[PDB]
Structure formats: structure tokens, C-alpha cells
Write a protein that binds this ligand. Structure first.
Ligand SMILES: [Zn+2]
Lengths: 42, 62, 46, 66
């Protein structure tokens, strides 16, 4: 009855870490795009 | 000065008048296009400032 | 083996889902901002 | 009957104003050409950013929907 929950941590942390990856891609994208828009003013 | 062909200089003066009008109107049209370009550029810069403020808000407040 | 068993569900079925829901919320607002900003750039092109 | 001297002076003045106006038009047209070039470059970079964002979003859809 130990691995029945020790498997849910790998799946829950799988979806969580994948979400963190997507959040990293989106955050980096908004940073680069906002930097580009900032370059049109300089 | 010397003599000239009177009718030829009259016709040439009329041609120069029409060419002057046309060239002047081309200048006015080009200047107007430049004015519209400057205005559109300024407005676009304003909108870009708004979007930079928006992304700044959604980035530094999350 | 009660401590080691209930210790698992304390975080992997709670905290790991807490930061996951906060994470998907962040991805939602960031996705919306990217969509409206891309729409703004397309509006500049047209 | 047109007074030859006056008509010659008018010819000279018309050529002068014509050349002057042609040059003002040429300078304004050059400024507009530079503005259009800079705008073309800006629109090109904007197209680059739209390509990047579209690829990112489509990759998120291919990473979550499938
Ligand atoms: Zn004459």
C-alpha cells in the first residue's frame, strides 16, 4: 500500500513540472516580446 | 536680349504653368502622406506604450 | 508504517496540486496576455 | 501683342519656381521614402514576433490537447 501513493507523486509532479515548463515558455515569450516593444521606443 | 518666337514662348509659358501646378500638387500630396505617416507613427508608439504597461502589469504583479 | 504512508498524501495530493492549480492559473493569464498582445501586433500589421 | 520682355521674364520666373518646387517635392519624397523603409523594417520584426508567439501557442496546444 506504499507504491499505490508513491505513483501519484510522480504523476502529480509530472503534470506540475510540465505546467512549470509551459509557464517558463510563456513568461520568456512575454519577456522577449515586451523587450521588443520596448526597443521600438528607443 | 535677343528676339524670340512669340507664340512659342506663350505656349511654353502655358506649359510651364500647368507643370508648375501639377508639380506643386504632387509636393502637397507627398507632404500630406508624410504628415499622415508621422501621425500614425506617433499613435502607434502610444499604443505600444499602453501594451508595454499592460505586459509590465501582468509580469511584475504575478 | 502510518507516518510514511500518510506523509505522502499530505503533499503529493495537496501541495503538489496546490502549486499546480496556481501554475495553470498563471499559464491562463499569461496565455491570455500573449493572445491579446499578438492580436495587437496583427492589428498593427493590418 | 503680349509684351515680349514681360513674357520672357515670366518664362524665367516660371522655370525658377518649377525647379524650386520640383526640389521641395524631391526632398519631401525622400523623407517619406526613409519613413516607409523604417516602417517596413518595423513591420518585418513585428512579423517575426507574431511568428514566435504563434509557434509558442501552437506548441502549447500540441503539448496539451494531443
Ligand atoms: Zn514676343
Amino acid at each position: 500500500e506504499l507504491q499505490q501513493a508513491r505513483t501519484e507523486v510522480e504523476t502529480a509532479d509530472k503534470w506540475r513540472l510540465e505546467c512549470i515548463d509551459v509557464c517558463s515558455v510563456l513568461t520568456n515569450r512575454l519577456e522577449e516580446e515586451a523587450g521588443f516593444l520596448n526597443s521600438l521606443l528607443k | 536680349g535677343g528676339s524670340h518666337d512669340c507664340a512659342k514662348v506663350d505656349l511654353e509659358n502655358a506649359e510651364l504653368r500647368r507643370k508648375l501646378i501639377r508639380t506643386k500638387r504632387a509636393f502637397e500630396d507627398t507632404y500630406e502622406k508624410l504628415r499622415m505617416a508621422n501621425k500614425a507613427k506617433a499613435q502607434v508608439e502610444k499604443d505600444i506604450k499602453n501594451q508595454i504597461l499592460k505586459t509590465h502589469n501582468v509580469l511584475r504583479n504575478v
